[PDB]
Every structure is written in structure tokens, then in C-alpha cells.
Amino acid sequence: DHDKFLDDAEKHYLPKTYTFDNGTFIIRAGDKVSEEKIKRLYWASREVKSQFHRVVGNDKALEVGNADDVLTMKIFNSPEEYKFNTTDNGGLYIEPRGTFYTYERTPQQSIFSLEELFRHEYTHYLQARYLVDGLWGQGPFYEKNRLTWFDEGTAEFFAGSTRTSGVLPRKLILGYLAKDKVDHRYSLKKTLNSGYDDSDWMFYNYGFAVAHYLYEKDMPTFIKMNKAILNTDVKSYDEIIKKLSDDANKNTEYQNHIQELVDKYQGAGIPLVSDDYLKDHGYKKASEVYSEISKAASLTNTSVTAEKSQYFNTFTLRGTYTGETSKGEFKDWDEMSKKLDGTLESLAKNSWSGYKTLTAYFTNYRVTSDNKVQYDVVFHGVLTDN
Ligand SMILES: CC(=O)Nc1ccccc1OCc1cn(CCNC(=O)[C@@H](CC(C)C)C(=O)NO)nn1
Ligand SMILES: [Ca+2]
Ligand SMILES: [Zn+2]
């Protein structure tokens, strides 16, 4: 009956299953999706994850028992096979199933690569698990277009995550901005009120530009905005949006930022994972890895957990970082990001090629009773010591 037909369809279209992170990251794929590509997507998720948690400051799921305790990713062979299964929007995330859908494609079928679209949808999984309480489409953050620019603009933004250089702008998004008429560039206020009902969806790109403008030029506002969402503080979020929307000088800065982004189009890259993740790194004793990381990052109270994946094992090293006297959450955030990236580049300078697989982030800003900056710090990497 109808049971055999749904399962037969999934077998025909998605015969392959690839399992990572002790069963919590599952790629269901067509038989023409290469295993090299599967591996790239796994390490891409960790790059996006690391930058997301740095910005949000939380890595604990907001709810207990939700479907996205297991992330499933269904990657069809081609645009045609994706369409039949539902039309072509590139990809889609469904939070109550913890699942997103997209497809492999050639350069002749899309300007966007599979890894770019994957990075976008993975950001929606991160938003929905770690930042936006309740379910997508429900509650006050899903009235009045409150989060429409944010959900889609920060998903385009974090799709540009790198390993050791933070979040970088993406060439194809800048190309959309650059190709637009100057006269038609959205105001800050227009972008913050855009919705899925608009005449076109250029808000994805102007929404990206708001996120990137705040990231580079006003991280205090980005941090406060993320904290209001995290805390389901509608009043604080609305105060921030109104202050951004009503300040002409803020729009001037955002317009200037759009133009600087356009000027970067020619020389911009496409952040995708390095081939260095795919190398055969070889054995390195686990204790040496953990000790070298803890020393380079100046981490105390360190714990580690090991996970099994289809093609390798990984480790997640958690520690506390207590630095110097705090210069405020916002100045601290900037310093912490620079120190952490500098550590990642040092550990990869020379040594085990496995150090080129490391991603790192920090969360849960606080200060001690002596007013020292304090962060929970997290490293993730390949583990070749069974
Ligand atoms: C059901 C549910 O939980 N959704 C959900 C949850 C959390 C965050 C966002 C979510 O969906 C947002 C969305 C976006 N579209 C429009 C259709 N798709 C697209 O246009 C793509 C384009 C992108 C690949 C460039 C998209 O933007 N892909 O994402 N419809 N819901
Ligand atoms: Ca949610
Ligand atoms: Zn999206």
C-alpha cells in the first residue's frame, strides 16, 4: 500500500546514507553525490557552526526533545530529481522534522554550488536550535516580518564562514548587490521590514548587507540584537529595529557599507572548505593534541568527548578561558575572535596536518569576581587516535 511507495521513492531517489557525530548528523543522498562532496559538507557545517556560536554566544539547544536533536539532510542528485520531490527554491529547512532538502548540481544549472546552499540551510538549523525559541512560523517573532530579513540575511552571511578568518562576504551575493541599480538599493528601514510577500527577494541580499554592516561596523548592536532574539525579548528587538530604521545617519553608514561590499565583488572569494580537510592526516596521540591545543589557547578545566563518523572520528575539546581584565562584552568579543583565529593559524603553521581540521568558538561571556574576561571555549577536529 502507500507505505511501500513512499519507501520505494526514497530508495530510488536517496539510496545512500552517511552518518556523522554519533548518529546526530545524517546525510541522505542520491547515488551520484560523491563521497568527497559528502565529506566537504560535514566540515563545512563545522565552519558555519563555529562562527554562528561566536556571534550568538550560546551553544546549548533552547528546547529539550525537539526533532533537530538529529539533523537530517536530503541531497538529491540533480535539480530535476529535487523538483519531483518538491518548485525550485534551491533548498528548504523544516524545523519540526529537523531536516533540510537540496540537491547536487553542475555549474550550468546554478551559479550557487551545493556547498554554498548547504551552508545556507545549515544556518537555518543553527538559528532554529540555538537562537530562536519555539518553532519557525509561530509566536511574535513570526509576526510583522520581524525576523524575515534576519533569518535569510544571516543565513547568507554565515554561509560565508571560514576556518580561521571569521565570516567573509560571498562573491555571488556581492554580485547581486553590484548588478543592482544604485537608485534601487534598499534603505535600512526598507530591508528591516521586508517579507516573503515582496515583489522580489532582493531582501536576501540587502539583509546580508545589514548583517555584514553590523558585524564589521557595529558589533555591539549585532550582539544586542542576537541577545534579544535568544531571550525572546520582543521589546528589546523592536527598540533596536526602530533605532536602526529612524536614524538617517545609520542609513548613510549602511549605504556606504553596501558600496564598499560592491567594490569588493571583483576580488571576493567563495568561502568553501579547504582540500586540507580531505588529507590522510595520520596518527597523532590524542593526549598530545589536547595538550597542545590547551596550551596554545590557554584553556583550563578542559574536557573532551569523542564521536564516530562514517569516514573518521572527531573530538570536541571544551575548556574555560580566563584572560585579562574585561574591556566590556563588545571589546572583549573582538579581542577573543582575534586571539582564537591567531591560535588556529599557529597550530596549523607546522605540525600534524590534522590541525588543519580544527574549528573553534567561544560562548557564555562573563567576568570573574576579579573582573577578568571569561569564556567557554570549544575546539573541534579530526581524531586519528583510536
Ligand atoms: C518550515 C520551517 O521550519 N522553515 C524554516 C525554519 C527556520 C528558518 C528558516 C526556515 O525557512 C525559511 C523559508 C524560506 N522559504 C522560501 C523558500 N526557500 C528559498 O527561497 C531558499 C533560498 C536560498 C537557498 C537562497 C531558502 O531561503 N532556503 O532556506 N520558505 N521558508
Ligand atoms: Ca526554534
Ligand atoms: Zn533560507
Numbering used by the authors: 398 to 483, 490 to 789
Task: Copy text from the publication.
Bacterial collagenases process triple helical collagen under physiological conditions into small peptides and amino acids by targeting multiple sites. The collagenase unit is composed of an activator and peptidase domains. In the latter, two histidine residues in a HEXXH motif and a downstream glutamate coordinate the catalytic zinc ion.
We rationalized the screening results based on the crystal structure of 27 in complex with the ColG-PD, solved at a 1.80 Å resolution. The bound inhibitor occupied the active site from the S3 pocket to the S2′ binding site. In the S3 binding pocket, the ortho-acetamide group directly interacted with the edge strand via a hydrogen bond to the backbone amide of Glu498, while the aromatic phenoxy ring established π–π stacking interactions with the side chain of Trp539. This explains the observed preference for the ortho-configuration of the acetamide group. The central triazole ring hydrogen bonded with Glu555 and formed a π–hydrogen interaction with Tyr599 in the S2 binding pocket. The hydroxamate group coordinated, as expected, the catalytic zinc ion. The isobutyl group in the α-position formed hydrophobic interactions with Tyr607 and His523 in the S2′ pocket. The hydrophobic benzyl group of 33 can be expected to fit similarly into the S2′ pocket. An initial screening led to the identification of hydroxamate 27; the SAR study was performed using COLQ1-CU, which is articulated around a 1,4-disubstituted 1,2,3-triazole ring. The results revealed that both compounds inhibited clostridial and bacillary collagenases in the low micro- to submicromolar range.
